[model samples]
Target: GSSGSSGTGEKRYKCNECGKVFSRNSQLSQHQKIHTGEKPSGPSSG
Candidate 1:
């Protein structure tokens, strides 16, 4: 008999320079700012 395998775990992405891993790509992208020394800002309230 053939059975399918189940998966259980969060998504992971790794950074080459720091050897750091993230659960999501968006998170990794945001973390990259630290190395670039970039200050991120959001939309205005007005």
Candidate 2:
């Protein structure tokens, strides 16, 4: 049997374009930009 689960202040951010979910806004922000951009040209991606 599985133990009961309950929420512990969990939050998530979803991207409208890719429909991807992330636990942090920063992660979502970076993920969305990658899809929106044709190439990862900046040092941030490098």
Candidate 3:
């Protein structure tokens, strides 16, 4: 049962604008930032 449930695909979050779905909440949150124009922080040359 555990293995069966773990192997199943489940869409947890659905985007209202594109109707795209994701399995993890963190993924959905990161995707939403794309629409907001939020760039990922990284090492920058100063």
Candidate 4:
């Protein structure tokens, strides 16, 4: 169970390129993709 309202405040993680605010850094990182033509890269096997 969770309060869920944990993210009910103003955004903090904003993008300097477009001035867009986001609650989650992960979301902001993904949103930045619009500006960066980046490719998917994950960790390699051990």
Q: Report model 4's TM-score to 2 decimal places.
A: 0.49
Report, for every candidate in turn, its global Cα lDDT versus the true structure.
Answer: 0.72, 0.76, 0.75, 0.78
Candidate 2 ranges beyond 4 A from true positions: 1-8, 39-46
Residue 17 CA displacement from its true place in model 4, Å = 1.4
Taking the tens digit of each residue's C-alpha lDDT, what string does model 4 give over 1-46? 3867586665588987699989788888888878876657669543
Comparing 2 and 3 on lDDT, the stronger one: 2
Q: List the residue pairs that clash in candidate 1.
A: none
| TM-score of every prediction relative to native | 0.48, 0.53, 0.48, 0.49
Query: CA shift at 33, candidate 1, in angstroms?
Result: 1.8
Candidate 3 global TM-score: 0.48
Q: Which stretch of 10 consecutive residues in model 3 shows the poorest summed lDDT? A: 2-11
* Model 2 Cα lDDT, one tens digit per residue, 1-46: 2563755555667899978789888888888888665765676866
Which wins on lDDT, candidate 2 or candidate 4?
4
Candidate 2 clash figure, as a count: 0
lDDT of 3 by residue, 1-46 (tens): 5566564466578986567889897898888777776566679753
Q: Give the Cα RMSD of candidate 2.
A: 8.4
Task: Answer with 2 or 4, whichever has the higher TM-score.
Answer: 2
Output the number of the lDDT-best candidate.
4
lDDT of 1 by residue, 21-44 (tens): 998888898887678765566695
